[PDB]
């Protein structure tokens, strides 16, 4: 068994470990440190890390929003795609629900994706 391939799960669960227990001050300064290597990997057109950096902003700003702020039954925008998702329920940082165009398929987004319609 070559759990590495799991390496990711392991890193995963650290880094939310990690944000779980950050004051909104740490979380600003984690993110603001993550956008500027950002911006670097953006300028040299290393896509792969900037990706990575991306996921992970993505996430720490999960951690900035209250997860209270965002209601089971309604239904939202997903960022940067013409997608509507439908939350089934809160847990953590994810909201658990479907897109419109997938309802048969119960998934897991940040909140942090989650936009109020216009
Ligand atoms: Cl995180």
């Given amino acids: 068994v070559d759990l590495?391939?799991?390496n990711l799960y392991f890193q995963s669960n650290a880094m939310e470990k990690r944000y779980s227990q950050?004051?909104?001050?740490?979380?600003?300064?984690?993110?603001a440190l993550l956008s500027e290597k950002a911006?670097?990997?953006?300028?040299?057109?290393?896509?792969?890390?900037?990706?990575?950096?991306?996921?992970?902003?993505?996430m720490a700003k999960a951690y900035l929003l209250?997860?209270?702020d965002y209601s089971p039954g309604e239904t939202?925008?997903?960022?940067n795609t013409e997608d509507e998702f439908t939350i089934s329920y809160?847990?953590?940082?994810?909201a658990w629900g479907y897109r419109?165009?997938?309802?048969?398929?119960?998934?897991?987004?940040?909140?942090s994706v989650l936009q109020e319609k216009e």
């Fill in 22 to 31: 950050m004051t909104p001050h740490e979380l600003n300064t984690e993110i």
């Fill in 39 to 58: 911006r670097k990997a953006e300028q040299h057109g290393i896509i792969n890390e900037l990706a990575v950096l991306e996921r992970k902003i993505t």
């Fill in 100 to 111: 419109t165009s997938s309802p048969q398929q119960e998934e897991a987004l940040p909140i």
């Fill in 4 to 6: 590495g391939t799991e």
């Fill in 66 to 68: 209250n997860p209270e």
């Fill in 90 to 94: 809160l847990n953590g940082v994810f």
């Fill in 76 to 79: 939202y925008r997903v960022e």
